Amino acid sequence: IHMTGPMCLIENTNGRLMANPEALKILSAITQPMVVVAIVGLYRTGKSYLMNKLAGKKKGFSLGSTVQKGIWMWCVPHPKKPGHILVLLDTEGLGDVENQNDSWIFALAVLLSSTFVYNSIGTINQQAMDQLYYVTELTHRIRSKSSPDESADFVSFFPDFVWTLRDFSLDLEADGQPLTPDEYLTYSLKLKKGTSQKDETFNLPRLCIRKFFPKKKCFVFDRPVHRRKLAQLEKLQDEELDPEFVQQVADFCSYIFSNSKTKTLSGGIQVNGPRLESLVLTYVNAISSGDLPCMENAV
Ligand SMILES: Nc1nc2c(ncn2[C@@H]2O[C@H](COP(=O)(O)O)[C@@H](O)[C@H]2O)c(=O)[nH]1
């Protein structure tokens, strides 16, 4: 499975989402079952490191990928599942230079993925909650535009949720024992107690995550601390980064290689390369159509 590095699967150009033919021929060739893990988030938040580490790459921490966008893929063998492939998706360029296909790229990632990894800096903020809410419903509207006819049946389709918090080497709070990353999640996910229309327009995203993301793991990561940029524009190695950061991101990878399920369609048919090509074309066609059937909401 040659793939030395990542490759764009869906490119964002002129506000126009175009699926990659070169990427589709690759997917087609892979007959084995797939575990799709989408590392989504804002640009320049350290997503690439999770990708390289997940792809098994030893030297995978770049330092400034200076310029002078869409969904990139990386198909490697699954390091804990022989006969299974690991497809890695990355939402490139989200909010970089900034119709704004950010939500759509976000949605396709969640759609195509078997596991959903949201990557953000600092403490959990409303802005993240709102778009997480927005994508949940957006994915509902797109998936529904593919169903043979014009709700515990949509929750079964949704991927697992993983939140990776970055530069949040802070994460210091407790009751009597220090909070775990997981406990921090539920905490920052606690609903506001108030019969108001400000707390209402605050608890909706929380309520949405409560229903649509049943399995939820959280990861807090330390600030990556390393030797100075010895001649700029390079790619460091683990032995040159904060040992804690390396161990944290490894413990993350381990959770992925073990807990992440094989991508399945409706009826429970495992998804393989050619099956993912179909899903990429279907979903790109459902979006690029500018159609979208207006059915009832799902919140
Ligand atoms: N703030 C922050 N940047 C990181 C971290 N890990 C890697 N980076 C940097 O963030 C950039 C990665 O961009 P990305 O893949 O999220 O679009 C690279 O320039 C890399 O040097 C991290 O944990 N926190």
From Swiss-Prot:
Effect of residue 190 to R: In 8KR mutant; abolished ubiquitination by S. flexneri IpaH9.8
Main subcellular location of this protein, as a coarse class: membrane
A single GO cellular-component term on record: symbiont cell surface
Domain GB1/RHD3-type G residue range list: 31-261
Localization per Swiss-Prot or TrEMBL: Cytoplasmic vesicle membrane; Golgi apparatus membrane; Cell membrane; Cytoplasm, Cytosol
Outcome following mutation: residue 47 to A: Loss of GTPase activity. Constitutively monomeric. Expressed throughout the cytoplasm, loss of vesicular accumulation. Impaired ability to promote pyroptosis in response to T.gondii infection
Induction remarks: By IFNG during macrophage activation, and by TNF and IL1B.
GO process terms (BP): cellular response to interleukin-1; cellular response to tumor necrosis factor; cellular response to type II interferon; cytolysis in another organism; defense response to bacterium; defense response to protozoan; defense response to virus; innate immune response
Alphabetized UniProt keyword annotations: Antiviral defense, Cell membrane, Cytoplasm, Cytoplasmic vesicle, Golgi apparatus, GTP-binding, Hydrolase, Immunity, Innate immunity, Isopeptide bond, Lipoprotein, Membrane, Methylation, Nucleotide-binding, Phosphoprotein, Prenylation, Secreted, Ubl conjugation
Region (GTPase domain (Globular)): 1-294
Cross-link ((Microbial infection) Glycyl lysine isopeptide (Lys-Gly) (interchain with G-Cter in ubiquitin)): 190, 192-193
Residues that, per the record, bind GTP: 41-48, 63-65, 90-94
Post-translational modification: Isoprenylation is required for proper subcellular location. Phosphorylated at Ser-146 by PIM1 in absence of infection, inhibits GBP1: phosphorylation promotes interaction with 14-3-3 protein sigma (SFN), leading to GBP1 retention in the cytosol. Dephosphorylated in response to infection, liberating GBP1.
Effect of residue 146 to A: Reduced phosphorylation by PIM1, leading to hyperactivation and Golgi fragmentation
Reaction(s) catalysed (UniProt annotation): GTP + H2O = GDP + phosphate + H(+); GDP + H2O = GMP + phosphate + H(+)
An example Gene Ontology molecular-function term: Hsp90 protein binding
Mutagenesis / variant outcome for changing residue 145 to A: Abolished phosphorylation by PIM1
Topology of the protein relative to the lipid bilayer: Lipid-anchor
Top-rank lineage group of the source organism: Eukaryota
Residues found modified as Phosphoserine: 146
Effect of residue 167 to N: Strongly decreased nucleotide-binding
Subunit structure: Homodimer; homodimerization occurs upon GTP-binding and is required for the second hydrolysis step from GDP to GMP. Undergoes conformational changes and oligomerization upon GTP-binding and hydrolysis. Heterodimer with other family members, including GBP2, GBP3, GBP4 and GBP5. Dimerization regulates subcellular location to membranous structures. Interacts with SQSTM1. Interacts (when phosphorylated) with 14-3-3 protein sigma (SFN); leading to GBP1 retention in the cytosol and inactivation.
Protein's job: Interferon (IFN)-inducible GTPase that plays important roles in innate immunity against a diverse range of bacterial, viral and protozoan pathogens. Hydrolyzes GTP to GMP in two consecutive cleavage reactions: GTP is first hydrolyzed to GDP and then to GMP in a processive manner. Following infection, recruited to the pathogen-containing vacuoles or vacuole-escaped bacteria and promotes both inflammasome assembly and autophagy. Acts as a positive regulator of inflammasome assembly by facilitating the detection of inflammasome ligands from pathogens.
Entry's family note: Belongs to the TRAFAC class dynamin-like GTPase superfamily. GB1/RHD3 GTPase family. GB1 subfamily.
Name of the protein in question: Guanylate-binding protein 1
Organism, as annotated: Homo sapiens (Human)
Included stretch of the parent chain: 5 to 316 of 592
